[PDB]
Amino acid sequence: QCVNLTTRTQLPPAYTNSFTRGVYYPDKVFRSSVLHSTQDLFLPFFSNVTWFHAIHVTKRFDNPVLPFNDGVYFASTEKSNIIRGWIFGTTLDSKTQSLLIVNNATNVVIKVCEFQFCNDPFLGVYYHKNNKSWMESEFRVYSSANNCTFEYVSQPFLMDLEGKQGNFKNLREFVFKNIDGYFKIYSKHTPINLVRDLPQGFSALEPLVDLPIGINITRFQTLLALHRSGDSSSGWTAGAAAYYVGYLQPRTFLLKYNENGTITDAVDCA
Amino acid sequence: NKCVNFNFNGLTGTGVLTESNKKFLPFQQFGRDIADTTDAVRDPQTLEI
Numbered sequence: 001q002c003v004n005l006t007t008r009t010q011l012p013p014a015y016t017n018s019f020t021r022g023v024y025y026p027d028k029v030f031r032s033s034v035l036h037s038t039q040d041l042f043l044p045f046f047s048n049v050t051w052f053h054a055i056h057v058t059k060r061f062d063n064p065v066l067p068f069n070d071g072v073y074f075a076s077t078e079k080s081n082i083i084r085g086w087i088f089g090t091t092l093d094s095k096t097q098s099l100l101i102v103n104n105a106t107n108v109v110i111k112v113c114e115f116q117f118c119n120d121p122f123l124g125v126y127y128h129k130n131n132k133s134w135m136e137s138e139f140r141v142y143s144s145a146n147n148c149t150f151e152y153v154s155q156p157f158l159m160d161l162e163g164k165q166g167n168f169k170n171l172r173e174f175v176f177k178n179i180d181g182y183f184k185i186y187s188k189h190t191p192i193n194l195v196r197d198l199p200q201g202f203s204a205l206e207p208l209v210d211l212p213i214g215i216n217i218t219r220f221q222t223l224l225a226l227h228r229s230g231d232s233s234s235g236w237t238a239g240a241a242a243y244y245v246g247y248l249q250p251r252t253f254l255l256k257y258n259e260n261g262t263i264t265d266a267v268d269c270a
Numbered sequence: 271n272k273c274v275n276f277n278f279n280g281l282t283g284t285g286v287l288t289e290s291n292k293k294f295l296p297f298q299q300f301g302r303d304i305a306d307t308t309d310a311v312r313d314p315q316t317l318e319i
């Protein structure tokens with residue numbers, strides 16, 4: 001069962017500037033001390049990326065249904081692991097094969113299945129005052145799933161889930177691409193000491209997985225956790241969190257490697 | 271230390287393999303010198319460069 005939450009204020013959309021962000025290793029070929037030109041789908045330097053916020057203070061619960069043109073760069077400045085995963089598809093209603101990648105309190109699930117995704121997929125954490133403890137309570141994403149082919153579940157772990165106070169600390173940068181029937185996920189991750197922005201700087205993403213799914217992805221959504229400790233659609237908190245979305249386009253970049261294999265500077269030719 | 275015809279994960283070539291001081295990243299298999307000519311390869315079985 002799903003409930004569409006209410007008590008959510010409407011603001012415009014917001015936007016920000018991405019400074020030399022969204023650079024990965026185009027290929028798996030180690031190069032050392034070299035100035036390589038490569039043409040591939042990148043996030044242009046000094047681009048504008050869509051800003052989505054999740055702040056307590058409204059409760060600014062952002063999880064809209066965004067397009068997926070040719071790839072997405074997804075950055076998350078988080079503190080308490082509010083963003084949990086993503087969903088990709090065409091219709092999201094089990095008519096067409098969708099994908100979901102979730103990181104619940106225990107496991108990392110990756111399913112390519114015919115989910116009946118509801119309008120407001122999310123996960124819910126419950127906080128106990130009797131003994132202070134946070135743990136996953138609800139998992140509202142999907143109704144039904146009959147035909148499907150690809151599943152993966154990672155070795156169980158124990159995850160924080162607790163809501164800290166302060167500024168954001170963890171930057172999670174992820175690159176999604178769907179090409180040659182391969183869903184390519186590049187990721188990387190960096191301690192930050194900002195308050196509200198998506199840092200500047202350089203950091204090359206390294207590939208994480210290559211799922212051989214071969215589906216037809218045009219839209220996607222993020223899915224993030226809420227805090228509870230009201231009714232079914234009013235009794236929930238957001239938790240500090242922010243995430244930025246960009247949209248890859250075919251570009252020439254001239255990368256620089258170190259004396260190592262790690263990409264230490266790039267320039268967008270256009 | 272011998273002229274050998276080698277095949278490392280589809281990468282076919284001819285030459286002599288020797289111990290190398292180069293340090294590859296965990297996700298990098300083979301390294302190319304300038305001009306994109308193969309220069310080093312990590313043997314997948316034991317991850318030796």
Ligand SMILES: *[C@@H]1O[C@H](CO)[C@@H](O)[C@H](O)[C@H]1NC(C)=O
Nearest residue numbers: 014015016017047048049050
């Ligand atoms: C870049 O982002 C959006 C794209 O929709 C655009 O409206 C905006 O004016 C552009 N510039 C800045 C500074 O955001």
